Every structure is written in C-alpha cells, then in structure tokens.
C-alpha cells in the first residue's frame, strides 16, 4: 500500500526542505537586486510578489510572463535555472530507478494510489485559491459599501 505522499519518495525530506529554503532565498535576493537601487527607479516589474512568482515558474519549468533584465537579476535567474534543471532531472531519474528496480524483482501500470497525494494537493490549492479570492472580493465589496 503506497503512501499518500509517495511521489516525494525519490528525493529526501532534507532535499525538499532545502529546496523551499533556496526558493525563498532566491526570491528575496531577486527582489533586492531588482528594486533596491533608486537609480533603477520602477523600470522592472520585479517586486517581492512578482519575484516569488518568477521563481516558482522557473522551478516548475513554466516561464510565466517576465524575465529579469538587470545583470544581477539575470545572474539569479540563471543560477536558479541551473538548480531547477538539475533537481528536476534528478527527481525524474530517481523515480525511474525506483520503478525499474520494483519491476525487475522476482499492476505494471502506475495506479492512482501512487499519485493520489498530488491530486489532493491540487484540489487543496484550488480550494485555497477560491477562499482567498472570495475573501478579497468580500473585503473590496465592504470597502466600497463604506465609501458609498
């Protein structure tokens, strides 16, 4: 009986924790090197909110809408891209090794039990986004009612 979060098996928990830490650090450094200097004020669409979005899209290998234009921002983006490529390839290779070793011991297709955790996370994220949007809409509607 595979675990619910059995899709995190190829990498260790320490790797995931360090991945989250590295993502946070890269996002903060990108925001800093994007908007700290008054002499660049901005001309770049890289705030703290947009920096985290760019880093997430880079890790998921889905370039969303923007790319850094300054030298430091591009350095951050390049090192993050290299890290992401290595980590994703490592995950895929280790999962393939796990599956091949399980297949070669003395049904065959992947079952929904092996990826049920990713579905749970996806639906939880959909619900969280719905709740956030509803709260924002309620706050904006209340603000308009008070003003009017």
């Amino acid at each position: 009986k595979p675990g619910v979060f059995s899709f995190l098996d190829p990498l260790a928990y320490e790797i995931w924790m360090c991945i989250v830490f590295a993502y946070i650090g890269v996002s903060v450094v990108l925001f800093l090197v994007s908007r700290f200097s008054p002499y660049e004020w901005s001309t770049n669409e890289f705030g703290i909110f947009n920096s985290l979005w760019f880093s997430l899209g880079a890790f998921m290998q889905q370039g969303c809408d923007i790319s850094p234009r300054s030298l430091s921002g591009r350095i951050v983006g390049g090192v993050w891209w290299f890290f992401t490529l290595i980590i994703i390839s490592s995950y895929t290779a280790n999962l393939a090794a796990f599956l091949t070793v399980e297949r070669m011991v003395s049904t065959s297709a992947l079952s929904l039990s092996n990826v049920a955790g990713v579905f749970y996370i996806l639906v939880g994220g959909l619900g969280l986004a719905m709740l956030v949007a509803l709260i924002e809409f309620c706050y904006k509607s209340r603000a308009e009612a008070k003003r009017m």
Partner: protein, 188 residues
C-alpha cells in the same frame, strides 16, 4: 440570451443533481467478482452494498464493509483515515449537497433581481460540488486499489461533474454580464 442562459443553467443544474443523486444511491459502480452473504461469483458493488450477480444467490445484496478487521491490523493511520473517508462517502454526499444549494440559489435568483450575489454563490457552489465529486472519485478509486470494470452509476457521477462544471461557467458568465450591465447603465 439572458432567458436562454437561465434556462440552460437550470436544466444543467437539475441534470447534474439528478445524475449525482442516482449515482450515489445506485450500486452499479464497480463490476468485480466476489464472495456473497458474508464462493467466487461476479457481483456489482456501489458505495454501500454489493449485489451478487448471475449466481446461485443472485439478487441478494451484502453491505460492503470498509473496515476489514478480521486480522486486527492497523498499519499506518493514513490507511485508517482513507478507510473512514471512503466509508462515509463524505465527498460524493458533499457534492450532492453543494449541487442542491446551488440549485436553491439559482431558483432564488429570480425572486431578487437586484441581489446579484446569489448567482455568484450558485456558481461557487457548483464549482465546489465538482471539486468534491473529484475528491470522491479519487478516494473511491484509491480505496478500491487498497479483472474489474466501472458501471453506469460510476460514469453518472463522472458525467455529473462535467455538467456541474459547465453550469458553474454559465453562472459566473451570467454574473459577469449583470455587473457589466449595471456599469453600462451608470455610464449613461
């Protein structure tokens, strides 16, 4: 058109609610051979009881037990949580309830034309019902994993999800038009 949009929304909501109510209540969810009145005989199982088919004791239905404690095994708490979630059918029932409340909101939208938030609430309920149907399908399949075929009752819930999501799109589109119309009138 506004009237045609309302008609389509109501028809789709009623169809989705009926399909989910039939799917949850009916027992043609899975075609699997199994024992009876607890020999090997082909049966069809739903969410509560499995009815033995084409056998010597055909017709009789045995209540499905989601906690096979014959060996008194616990393993990890994740398995117990999944078994408890699947046994109650909390997610298909929640989807049916959300569909029913969305239909109520759609019906009550006609009485109060000024209050546009009822249409948005109906759309939100329809989308949440679809998501609950998705979670129920995932949980049901995972519990079944922990030859076989899926009957028409299972596909009734699958078709209800597609219809419920389609109606949710229609409702929010109707909410979008209502606010744009209000803004257009204020422009003049």
């Amino acid at each position: 058109d506004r009237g045609v949009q309302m008609l389509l929304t109501t028809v789709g909501a009623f169809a989705a609610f009926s399909l989910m109510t039939i799917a949850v209540g009916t027992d043609y969810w899975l075609y699997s051979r199994g024992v009876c009145k607890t020999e090997e005989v082909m049966t069809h199982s739903g969410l509560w009881r499995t009815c033995c088919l084409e056998g010597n004791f055909k017709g009789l239905c045995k209540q499905i037990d989601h906690f096979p404690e014959d060996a008194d095994y616990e393993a990890d708490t994740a398995e117990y949580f999944l078994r408890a979630v699947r046994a109650s059918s909390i997610f298909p029932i929640l989807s049916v309830i959300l569909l029913f409340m969305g239909g109520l909101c759609i019906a009550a939208s006609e009485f109060y034309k000024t209050r546009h938030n009822i249409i948005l609430s109906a759309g939100i309920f329809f989308v949440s019902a679809g998501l609950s149907n998705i979670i129920g399908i995932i949980v049901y399949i995972s519990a079944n994993a922990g030859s076989y075929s899926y009957g028409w009752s299972f596909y009734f819930g699958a078709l209800s999800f597609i219809i419920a999501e389609m109606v949710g799109v229609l409702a929010v589109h109707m909410f979008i038009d209502r606010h744009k119309q209000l803004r257009a009138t204020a422009r003049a």
